[PDB]
């Protein structure tokens, strides 16, 4: 558990330091020196937008990709005694790509809204640009993570489908209903991301 111990030690020290610094700023009655509004305003909306775009596409493929090999290994292993599996159980992978597609479409549609500002001093500049920037960030994150977890779900379910079908061909069709729910969960994230960027403007 050498790596888990490293991850934990970093995690604990990271937040423990934040607690000490935060409380100290309070204790020493600093003039709101740690100003969240300052961080949000100085941080260029361009980063937030491009980050959300990269997340929307990058997280979604990670999900799909995760599930693909989950079900790939189960299919390949079981298929040694039940080669019929490849005929029908490949649809589990189609669902996995489909989860990536949901995010991919949004990633492009969102990025199509990215524009320059020709802006400098945030003071009274880009009021709408900050809203659109944060919204695009959220919408990208929304769909990215939603597809990420969907892809894992579909992989786990598809694995059971392959193992089941190897022993009873009648089970395949009924199980398909579970993966459909998995796909629907990802679509829900798409609906929200669409709404979040439904009324935005850049530039």
């Amino acid at each position: 558990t050498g790596l888990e111990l490293l991850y934990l030690g970093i995690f604990v020290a990271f937040w423990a330091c934040m607690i000490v610094v935060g409380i100290c700023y309070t204790i020493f009655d600093l003039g709101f020196r740690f100003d969240v509004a300052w961080f949000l305003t100085e941080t260029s909306p361009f980063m937030w937008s491009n980050l959300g775009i990269g997340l929307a596409i990058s997280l979604s493929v990670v999900g799909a990709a995760w599930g693909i090999y989950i079900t790939g290994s189960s299919i390949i292993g079981g298929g040694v005694k039940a080669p019929r599996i490849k005929t029908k159980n490949l649809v589990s992978i189609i669902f996995c790509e489909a989860v990536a597609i949901y995010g991919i479409i949004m990633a492009i549609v969102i990025s199509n809204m990215a524009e320059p500002f020709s802006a400098t001093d945030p003071k009274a500049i880009g009021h709408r640009n900050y809203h659109a920037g944060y919204s695009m960030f959220g919408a990208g994150l929304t769909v990215g993570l939603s597809n990420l977890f969907c892809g894992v779900c579909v992989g786990i379910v598809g694995s059971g489908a392959a193992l089941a079908d190897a022993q009873n061909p009648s089970l395949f069709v009924k199980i398909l209903i579970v993966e459909i729910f998995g796909s629907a969960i990802g679509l829900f994230g798409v609906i929200v991301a669409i709404l979040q960027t439904s009324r935005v403007k850049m530039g």
């Binding site: 790596l3 961080f39 100085e42 941080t43 260029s44 980063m47 980050l51």
Partner: protein, 40 residues
Amino acid sequence: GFFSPGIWMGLLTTLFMLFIFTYGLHMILSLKTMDRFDDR
């Protein structure tokens, strides 16, 4: 001040990609080879 816009934004992107690197490296390190081969 302790941080500038530049420094902070740089740290934010650095950590995001550092997490990606960590994820990749994690699974790469946790990679084993075979103890023995099945047959001749």
